[PDB]
Design a protein around this motif. Sequence first.
Motif, mmCIF file in Angstrom:
data_model
loop_
_atom_site.group_PDB
_atom_site.id
_atom_site.type_symbol
_atom_site.label_atom_id
_atom_site.label_comp_id
_atom_site.label_asym_id
_atom_site.label_seq_id
_atom_site.Cartn_x
_atom_site.Cartn_y
_atom_site.Cartn_z
ATOM 1 N N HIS A 1 0.794 -1.226 0.000
ATOM 2 C CA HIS A 1 0.000 0.000 0.000
ATOM 3 C C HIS A 1 0.840 1.297 0.000
ATOM 4 N N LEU B 1 2.455 1.664 -2.655
ATOM 5 C CA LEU B 1 2.350 1.805 -4.111
ATOM 6 C C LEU B 1 1.042 2.425 -4.593
ATOM 7 N N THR C 1 -5.297 5.155 -4.064
ATOM 8 C CA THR C 1 -6.725 4.862 -4.088
ATOM 9 C C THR C 1 -7.384 5.910 -4.985
HETATM 10 O O1 LIG Z 1 -2.575 2.884 -3.198
HETATM 11 C C1 LIG Z 1 -2.132 3.603 -2.074
HETATM 12 C C2 LIG Z 1 -2.868 3.009 -0.867
HETATM 13 C C3 LIG Z 1 -2.679 3.613 0.349
HETATM 14 C C4 LIG Z 1 -3.276 3.110 1.482
HETATM 15 N N1 LIG Z 1 -4.090 2.052 1.401
HETATM 16 C C5 LIG Z 1 -4.328 1.436 0.247
HETATM 17 C C6 LIG Z 1 -3.715 1.903 -0.908
#
Ligand SMILES: OCc1ccncc1
Length: 292
Positions: A173, A175, A178
């Motif tokens: 995460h 990377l 969202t």
């Molecule tokens: O894609 C970045 C991200 C950040 C936090 N949670 C899930 C994904």
Amino acid sequence: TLVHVASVEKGRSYEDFQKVYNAIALKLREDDEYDNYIGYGPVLVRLAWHISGTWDKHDNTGGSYGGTYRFKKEFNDPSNAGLQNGFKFLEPIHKEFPWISSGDLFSLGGVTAVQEMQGPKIPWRCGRVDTPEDTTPDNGRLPDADKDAGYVRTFFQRLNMNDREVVALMGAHALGKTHLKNSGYEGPGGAANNVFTNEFYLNLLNEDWKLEKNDANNEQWDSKSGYMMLPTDYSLIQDPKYLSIVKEYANDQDKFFKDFSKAFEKLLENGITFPKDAPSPFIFKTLEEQGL
Ligand SMILES: OCc1ccncc1
Ligand code: HEM
């Protein structure tokens, strides 16, 4: 109780799969503008995880083996919204190498992405075999983001993952980002979102997080630096067992890399029986290592 035996694509060896790796890696290099200059690395990692994360250890349904993401029921899963971009990226690769199975291609995309983003080597095994449309798992097997640590631990036990494996896998995460239109969450986990690092853990521990309701009416944790965490991410510092492991990985990127490599290979191989005489796992050279 379904058994899925790995079967090597007929006549293919390490060198053949290295050529597929290389084609993915060259396209990753070329398509650098995608998602406001993030590139396709993160979405390919998410794709490899979502095609694997449908697995149920109780009856061996789902998992990466059958390549079932190619069927509309799975492709159209709300949990998979946005992954169509990764599928479309892989289409020309599959046209160049029609002999590779869909599960091998989707899982190899994730391995290639991690390595080309300067992550750890991930050993990878071939021999997933495409299965028919009626073997596609129903929607609803991938995890919700609005939940707590107990939910995360219970969820991942369905995939035979333990606390260390869960915390290591979640480091992905760091990377990408969202996207509100895909998932109802918005923002990146950190600054270096197309280079594989331990930033996720550092940010969890070191940022000033504020719980906020986003424009989709979902709760997420937002930092002054413009980063975000899902409730399930933040649960890793609320649960005492998870917190200890987050600190370990924040302190030691090399340990994170070792543990991620193992967990991600395990994730991508769940459900698959490898004959005792199957090839050893392949470790692909990066483009850089080959002078390409
Ligand atoms: O894609 C970045 C991200 C950040 C936090 N949670 C899930 C994904
Ligand atoms: C509790 C478990 C997890 C939850 C709830 C979850 C949830 C999410 C959500 C909601 C997104 C945003 C999707 C979008 O809007 O485009 C996301 C993105 C992502 N997920 Fe997870 N995730 C989980 C575990 C994992 C695991 C195990 C991996 C891989 C090892 C992973 C890799 C990624 C990556 C790389 C992205 C960024 C994708 C992009 O930039 O397009 N996730 N995840």
